[PDB]
Structure 1
């Protein structure tokens, strides 16, 4: 560099070390003054990083160099100057640099290796030498560069690179070892699989180098390696098959060694568990995984109240978790997660081997652990455990009265967890065992923690319990809970209110009995602490719904005044109990809520208008932004962003409430429609960073319209704006799941708005979207390895609904646009994948409903007649509906196919009468009835397919036909066929039947409804003329 340039830059970069003022003045100077100067700047910084004897200036420059070299970008730099930079960087790397500075140089160097940059063979050469150096920092930094630039691994000869890694794993220095493993795993995460087979052979060397960490007592570094291995299991789990037992045994060995600090034990557990989430067939196929996993997690769950056998510290504290019981926490999460992926088929047996034993230990911690373990595994193993239910209770329930209060707590928990996981069956079956067990723990004989947890477990039970089942136990439950309500400890009171609330909600009308006593107790609590009052308001309004409006009106006025007070006064946890309560009052009050809207809606508007609160951010400026629970950072197109997740979640919550107020208030909500639609719903579709928002936006639309419609041009303006943005969203929406919501949204919009609600350019725009969606679905299904082991059906189901909706609103005229995507529809019809076939068949049936299709008759009847006798009942269903609809709307143009196939329909109609394909064969039945109407042996066949109970449109036709086959000793089958249809709520046919019964003796007539029980004879009486 020119000598002047140097001291200019030297001064500025020295201003960087320091204060805001001196350091911002330097920042300005650089960003304002320094495409004319970039290569000088780059050259300067690279020289500083390489040669400056000042640590701080050196570091700074290296970091700056890295930042500015991406921004440049490095590609657009003069070959002449790249070379100089590369050489000085390399010279600095190979000189005497402090460890931290070599790291930064390494990362700068990485910025100068790029596929389209001129070849840099000096780097390869310097790395090969450095890996052989006796200075650990040279070795570490070399693997680091191969971590950042993994493609360099491909550029080295295979017979050099393999020994490089084997040496890496084996190195004297732990830091070198960590860097080699990082680099090794990094390889897999940056290169295509076609390249993997080339380092894969090394996994054994890596695994074999593991026990050495334990020998050296270097378990903290073991944890780092376990973390790289965790990533490798996600990428290439199969690679570990057949060294499988050796990693399993090794992690077993480590987890059991309980004077290791926990990091190495918890990461080893994570390694174990992650296999089940990435290679379930593998873990299932070896008995040893399940066994080690269960054994190991049971041990860890024992690690509670350490050095505190009485649990003194725990009885005194609140019912929140002591998050300092880390290994215990990890163990239950693990057991849960594995159980979920492998199922009970695979782990009930090993689990129970160990439970039996620990249940009876004299170590309380083990009896506890057994409860917590069952409790963790229960969801996952539901499939098997749902039928070992009395056996479970026999083991669990004795401990309800265990000497030790934590075992008691433990027992309450299992009863709670199980009540949820085995619902609704367990409510029906075990109330006689469960409720008394729990109720007995409510008494003030027991400790605060246990009483509260028993009360907690009662919520779990109640969620899925019948009012009828709970009824005999209410008095007992209530009297006990009232005691806890008076407890002296905040948390006991709070749980008591919540338990009462949720019991009440289940009890419904059976709770009316208890209302007069409870409600003033509740009012007094309110008049007297945010969670208490919120939990109290929640309890009051849940009680209010359970008892109904009239009864709730005894205190509603006062309650409402307290709500208002609470809302407008000087925890954000309260805001929610308030919101949900107002909303619950509106479900109780019906139209009487309307006066309250001006209290309740304004705060919801504010929240529901939160903008996409985004920070276009920088690489380092992330990991710290990531610290916050309330924030998450993602990458859009390489360049990153910080999104305030909490705020966006809150927007959704508020939109949900706006949506339910609209749904219940209907016409009454009309005053808000324009505001919510334009300032909330619609802008929400452009929230590309949060799909909940986008979805809530779409579901709001038709509900808003329907509200304005019921009250009253603006409706049209709004609808036009809305439908347009939905349609345009169909082409640009990346998530198929959201795409489905838009279509469903349009269908609902169309049903609200009625006839011809869409314009011609809209219809064309909807077709491109439909086409893009059909295109992207085909391409995803043409997807499905050496290393690895309904959202599409649902989307297509909805697209069928939108197309039908659009056809109906246009009354056929959409057939013109429909021609453009016939190639799509055709490919589908003759693919193999049954889902695409069903889609196309269903579209086809819609086309025919609107004799102008002959154009195509020749193209799809061959496939339809195939489909008729497919193994797949959903295919037969779609096909027969098509044939039925052919005869109905296009009778002369399809007379030739319909009558031939008529025999096929008599055959398909005869597994037919099952639940699973009752659907299919009911359509066939209706299909033949349709044909017999459009154009005697056949009709007698048809009859032997009644009654029709599952499909509504089919049933509609068959009994219309049955009514014509009459008005223009089968008599008890005739009547029954009809009674069954009504009774099963599938579908004037009655008028025809009356006349038939007229033509019989009074005693013959009466004997038909000999068979029928009282409840359906109550209904029969109220059906007849």
Structure 2
């Protein structure tokens, strides 16, 4: 179909793939033009179809696929696309190698698009290929259906259903995998309105599963499981009436431990994932939780195979054995499910098993019981927090088990639950936990057990008071000093860390032990980077615990050693946090150490986005590394160095903390950090952590400059605010949008009055609109899915209200004009059924009056079942009578009723309504209305509301209510809601003889009476 000329030229080029680079240039610069692209695509499609050289055909098919997107295939003439399609199809039906038909299939897929004229030759080609006796023909057909799922819509329903049913049952496992892949792929690509069309085939798929176990093909079973895992995340309700069959089948696979791990782990994952996508379905079925618990407990047993003495486990690291895969999966599975379903559902089936396993003569079951409880403790905390002497009655007796890994196992529970059940367990079970853990620190126990007990002491210490730790400290430290003398490095390192965080909790109670520990620490440093890092961490944490004055006995020597260590990646982080910790200790005396500490932080915080314009094949190949991630922006892939950008964030966080502590002392760096680090970080579109860290950096930097000193502060703020504003109408992540608004408020708070210009205020209104528009759109968005986590929208709308309030305040009103442009959207929120948008709109209006067609909804919102809506509404009515009558006085008995309430959840609402009474009662000044308002006192939660109730109370002054008058003030002060009504009260007590005056305070205890006298005359 091409001139013989063009063929030899292009054949040479494709074959050449000095000689090669000349071909790559020739292709990309000469043969991808408006004048040559059609000839090239025609050529490559012919080579892929007809060439009998393996490499030429393969590359051409690959090249054709890539360049088909870029052209795009749409702008290709009719006569040539027809020839290209027909040649691709002819090559498909010919005899090609498996890999080439795969690449032909991928090439064919690029020629199917709603843009293009219909291609019914392909549909009929696929239908017959699916019946072919060659598995590769059947497999490749499903592959095309996977890449182009809309072809499934094109085939008649009575043809496509038998096709998949034949696919699920096919004698070839490659075909079955491809059939399942295509089936699931249909659901992840098409709208839900198309789902009830292949959905009826799920029973056929599930019924095909037992075949994999009969043929002994568990490897193919794992692949199908993974496809099923994806379907559960898309349409869990589809599994509802065959739920028990899924459960029993996964149970059967997992119990069969003659199978390999992949079939067993994927089966577990399938079971697990139901709890994350259909929690109500799991809870309405007792068989799920029982099976899940039973199956994970079996897998946790699989440890130390062919090693009953655990003589290999005793002799190794305190790191995890990477070979105990099924054990690891079982732990995470139980944890994940418990977190989703809660304690009240699966605490009982869990403990029904734990009671049994605790008494076994097989130590692996005794060990597993401890690990299971450790994994399930957090998710089941709502129940297990109450059964907290019960658990220790099982766990603590196992601490002295003959087998060391059961001992280790027992330490792990006490550690895990010290975190999950904090801070209540520290206050309640310190008498049982600490002696248990201490008894295992002794050197007669094996190294692994000492270390894990010491590790558990870190968990306990984190939320333990210094008063509780105090009588245990000496015994704790004498034991840990022994661990410090171990010949095993990981025992030494754990000893240092345990001591450090025991000291952190002990605080000033640790000054007792400074003189004996610090020289031992210095000795270690003077002579294993992990050791020295943990040692310096221990030294500085002790320093912050005992205080600056005590720390100064070794601080300079400690600092000199730090310098040697720094200029000599775990170590780098230990050194950074040590420097930062010393700054918290020394205060302003850290300033001379800034030239040492800051410059390396500056370098790391200036890292750019290490981007790699990447290509299809050599991706995923980069995904192996945890320090690399790849995403798609608009079609073309990219590869980004995530770790480098994570390090950037960590450095920015340290710079921010130094700036926060030092304040004015840090002003010298403000201009550099703002222009080279903070603001450029906002343009980091492939890492939202950097964007967030850059935003929070801004107000604190300006805060540093203001305290020290200005056109620079104004120029930097104008630059910072403008880029913050500009981010609002562009930022895709709603989470980041919240940070910018929050950053603006904090910035406005710092800069003060008149800090914004007319342009800025207008561009801010644009951003507010786009933020409100996209939030409304997302919130206005089941047969397949069960009915939150979306406080992201609420938190976003939260901060927006504070920015508007802040902007209104700094403009001193003149933002009223700009704010009218977005009232149409504001109005919709107020009159939308949905609570979050209602609350937002109400709060905005309240801030408006602060400086006709909304009163209808507000009065309706006054009696709302939601307290949040009543609070916002009451404030609006109250604020109306404040500095803006035909509505206030009529609603005045509505708010009487709303007041009558004093419950923690609704205490805030009834206190605003209360205050709303007091200023209707102030501007209009009824004496029975005031008597009603008086029994709403005192106001203890809302600060601004209480601030006024007592202001009014002092106006009504400057009978038998005198002790109700006083106590109303006492409770306000003591609850820290109000802060001189005191002056008024003292006068009321003055008009009484002293004996009657003093007896009012004859009901208050010493605590409050101490405050009362430092309050009154």
> For residues 91 and 299 of structure 1, what CA distance do their matches in structure 2 show?
54
Q: What per-residue deviation string (whole Å, max 9, x for no partner) do you get for residues 872-909 of structure 1?
A: 2222222222222222212xxxx332223222232222
- Alpha-carbon shift at residue 191 of structure 1 (Å): 1.6
> For residues 51 and 862 of structure 1, what CA distance do their matches in structure 2 show?
75
Q: What per-residue deviation string (whole Å, max 9, x for no partner) do you get for residues 86-138 of structure 1?
A: 22222222222222222122221222222222222222222111111111111
Bigger mean CA deviation after superposition, 360-369 or 616-625 = 616-625
> For residues 820 and 44 of structure 2, what CA distance do their matches in structure 1 show?
64
Bigger mean CA deviation after superposition, 937-946 or 657-666 = 937-946
When residues 97 and 923 of structure 1 are mapped into structure 2, their CA distance, relative to the original with a 3 A threshold, is same
> For residues 507 and 207 of structure 1, what CA distance do their matches in structure 2 show?
58
> For residues 860 and 184 of structure 2, what CA distance do their matches in structure 1 show?
52
> For residues 142 and 863 of structure 1, what CA distance do their matches in structure 2 show?
59
Q: What per-residue deviation string (whole Å, max 9, x for no partner) do you get for residues 974-1023 of structure 1?
A: 22211211111111222222222222222222222221211222222222
> For residues 222 and 171 of structure 1, what CA distance do their matches in structure 2 show?
14
Question: 1:281 touches 1:789 (CA, 8 Å); kept in 2?
Answer: no
Bigger mean CA deviation after superposition, 728-737 or 398-407 = 728-737
Q: 1:615 aligns to what SS in structure 2?
A: strand
Bigger mean CA deviation after superposition, 1009-1018 or 537-546 = 1009-1018
Q: 1:632 aligns to what SS in structure 2?
A: strand
Q: 1:642 aligns to what SS in structure 2?
A: strand
When residues 465 and 124 of structure 1 are mapped into structure 2, their CA distance, relative to the original with a 3 A threshold, is same
- Alpha-carbon shift at residue 7 of structure 1 (Å): 2.5
> For residues 509 and 320 of structure 2, what CA distance do their matches in structure 1 show?
35
Q: What per-residue deviation string (whole Å, max 9, x for no partner) do you get for residues 417-450 of structure 1?
A: 1111111111111111111111111110111001
- Alpha-carbon shift at residue 24 of structure 1 (Å): 2.8
> For residues 475 and 789 of structure 1, what CA distance do their matches in structure 2 show?
49
Whether 1:925 aligns to 2:914 is yes
Q: 1:673 aligns to what SS in structure 2?
A: helix
Residue of structure 2 in register with 1:624 after alignment: 621
- Alpha-carbon shift at residue 968 of structure 1 (Å): 17
Q: What per-residue deviation string (whole Å, max 9, x for no partner) do you get for residues 128-155 of structure 1?
A: 1111111111111111111111111222
- Alpha-carbon shift at residue 789 of structure 1 (Å): 15
When residues 30 and 830 of structure 1 are mapped into structure 2, their CA distance, relative to the original with a 3 A threshold, is closer
> For residues 863 and 99 of structure 1, what CA distance do their matches in structure 2 show?
68
- Alpha-carbon shift at residue 596 of structure 1 (Å): 0.9
Question: 1:408 touches 1:450 (CA, 8 Å); kept in 2?
Answer: yes
Superposition pairs of residues 188-267 of structure 1, within 5 angstroms: 188-267=187-266
Q: What per-residue deviation string (whole Å, max 9, x for no partner) do you get for residues 930-951 of structure 1?
A: 1222122222222212111111
Give TM-score, length-normalised by structure 2.
Answer: 0.97
Q: What per-residue deviation string (whole Å, max 9, x for no partner) do you get for residues 819-853 of structure 1?
A: 22222222222222222222222222222221xxx
When residues 901 and 114 of structure 1 are mapped into structure 2, their CA distance, relative to the original with a 3 A threshold, is closer
> For residues 818 and 140 of structure 1, what CA distance do their matches in structure 2 show?
60
When residues 301 and 53 of structure 1 are mapped into structure 2, their CA distance, relative to the original with a 3 A threshold, is same
- Alpha-carbon shift at residue 194 of structure 1 (Å): 1.4
> For residues 815 and 10 of structure 2, what CA distance do their matches in structure 1 show?
69
Q: 2:631 aligns to what SS in structure 1?
A: strand
Bigger mean CA deviation after superposition, 738-747 or 94-103 = 94-103
Q: What per-residue deviation string (whole Å, max 9, x for no partner) do you get for residues 537-585 of structure 1?
A: 111111111111111111111111111111111xx11111111111111
- Alpha-carbon shift at residue 244 of structure 1 (Å): 1.1
Q: What per-residue deviation string (whole Å, max 9, x for no partner) do you get for residues 715-773 of structure 1?
A: 10011111111111111111221111111111111111111111111111111111221
- Corresponding residue to 2:1006 among 1014, 1019, 1023: 1014
Q: Could you list the runs of 5+ residues in structure 1 that have no partner in the other structure?
A: 851-857
> For residues 833 and 72 of structure 1, what CA distance do their matches in structure 2 show?
46
Give TM-score, length-normalised by structure 1.
Answer: 0.96
- Alpha-carbon shift at residue 476 of structure 1 (Å): 0.8
Question: 1:93 touches 1:106 (CA, 8 Å); kept in 2?
Answer: yes
Q: What per-residue deviation string (whole Å, max 9, x for no partner) do you get for residues 292-348 of structure 1?
A: 111111111111000011011111101000111011111111111111111112111
Bigger mean CA deviation after superposition, 807-816 or 896-905 = 896-905
> For residues 865 and 131 of structure 2, what CA distance do their matches in structure 1 show?
66
Question: 1:844 touches 1:882 (CA, 8 Å); kept in 2?
Answer: yes
> For residues 639 and 560 of structure 1, what CA distance do their matches in structure 2 show?
50
Residue of structure 2 in register with 1:1001 after alignment: 993
> For residues 110 and 813 of structure 1, what CA distance do their matches in structure 2 show?
58
Q: 1:362 aligns to what SS in structure 2?
A: coil
Superposition pairs of residues 23-34 of structure 1, within 5 angstroms: 23-34=20-31
- Alpha-carbon shift at residue 401 of structure 1 (Å): 0.6
Question: 1:251 touches 1:268 (CA, 8 Å); kept in 2?
Answer: yes
> For residues 752 and 942 of structure 1, what CA distance do their matches in structure 2 show?
38
When residues 138 and 443 of structure 1 are mapped into structure 2, their CA distance, relative to the original with a 3 A threshold, is same
> For residues 520 and 898 of structure 1, what CA distance do their matches in structure 2 show?
73
Bigger mean CA deviation after superposition, 997-1006 or 336-345 = 997-1006
Q: What per-residue deviation string (whole Å, max 9, x for no partner) do you get for residues 357-416 of structure 1?
A: 111111111111111111111111111111111111111111101100011111110111
- Alpha-carbon shift at residue 801 of structure 1 (Å): 1.0
> For residues 437 and 939 of structure 1, what CA distance do their matches in structure 2 show?
62
Residue of structure 2 in register with 1:560 after alignment: 559
- Alpha-carbon shift at residue 252 of structure 1 (Å): 0.7
When residues 837 and 12 of structure 1 are mapped into structure 2, their CA distance, relative to the original with a 3 A threshold, is closer
> For residues 700 and 655 of structure 2, what CA distance do their matches in structure 1 show?
10
Q: 1:637 aligns to what SS in structure 2?
A: coil
Bigger mean CA deviation after superposition, 167-176 or 925-934 = 925-934
Bigger mean CA deviation after superposition, 411-420 or 919-928 = 919-928
> For residues 227 and 862 of structure 1, what CA distance do their matches in structure 2 show?
54
> For residues 481 and 637 of structure 1, what CA distance do their matches in structure 2 show?
57
Bigger mean CA deviation after superposition, 248-257 or 614-623 = 614-623
Bigger mean CA deviation after superposition, 948-957 or 817-826 = 817-826
> For residues 193 and 829 of structure 2, what CA distance do their matches in structure 1 show?
32
Question: 1:884 touches 1:926 (CA, 8 Å); kept in 2?
Answer: yes
When residues 137 and 866 of structure 1 are mapped into structure 2, their CA distance, relative to the original with a 3 A threshold, is closer
- Alpha-carbon shift at residue 27 of structure 1 (Å): 2.2
Q: What per-residue deviation string (whole Å, max 9, x for no partner) do you get for residues 235-256 of structure 1?
A: 1111111111111111111111
- Alpha-carbon shift at residue 818 of structure 1 (Å): 1.9
Bigger mean CA deviation after superposition, 100-109 or 487-496 = 100-109
- Alpha-carbon shift at residue 688 of structure 1 (Å): 1.4
> For residues 896 and 51 of structure 1, what CA distance do their matches in structure 2 show?
87
- Alpha-carbon shift at residue 48 of structure 1 (Å): 2.0
- Alpha-carbon shift at residue 704 of structure 1 (Å): 0.7
> For residues 814 and 32 of structure 1, what CA distance do their matches in structure 2 show?
55
Question: 1:279 touches 1:789 (CA, 8 Å); kept in 2?
Answer: no
Question: 1:89 touches 1:105 (CA, 8 Å); kept in 2?
Answer: yes
Bigger mean CA deviation after superposition, 940-949 or 254-263 = 940-949
Bigger mean CA deviation after superposition, 831-840 or 156-165 = 831-840
Question: 1:632 touches 1:645 (CA, 8 Å); kept in 2?
Answer: yes
- Alpha-carbon shift at residue 811 of structure 1 (Å): 1.0
- Alpha-carbon shift at residue 865 of structure 1 (Å): 2.5
When residues 778 and 13 of structure 1 are mapped into structure 2, their CA distance, relative to the original with a 3 A threshold, is closer
Question: 1:699 touches 1:745 (CA, 8 Å); kept in 2?
Answer: yes
Residue of structure 1 in register with 2:376 after alignment: 377
Give the total of aligned pairs.
1006
When residues 929 and 639 of structure 1 are mapped into structure 2, their CA distance, relative to the original with a 3 A threshold, is same
> For residues 346 and 19 of structure 2, what CA distance do their matches in structure 1 show?
65
Question: 1:278 touches 1:789 (CA, 8 Å); kept in 2?
Answer: no
Whether 1:820 aligns to 2:811 is no
Q: Could you list the runs of 5+ residues in structure 2 that have no partner in the other structure?
A: none
> For residues 761 and 12 of structure 2, what CA distance do their matches in structure 1 show?
66
- Alpha-carbon shift at residue 40 of structure 1 (Å): 2.3
- Alpha-carbon shift at residue 519 of structure 1 (Å): 1.2
- Alpha-carbon shift at residue 42 of structure 1 (Å): 2.1
Bigger mean CA deviation after superposition, 169-178 or 117-126 = 117-126
Q: 1:908 aligns to what SS in structure 2?
A: helix
Q: 2:104 aligns to what SS in structure 1?
A: helix
Question: 1:609 touches 1:679 (CA, 8 Å); kept in 2?
Answer: yes
- Corresponding residue to 2:968 among 977, 995, 998: 977
- Alpha-carbon shift at residue 457 of structure 1 (Å): 0.6
Q: 1:453 aligns to what SS in structure 2?
A: helix
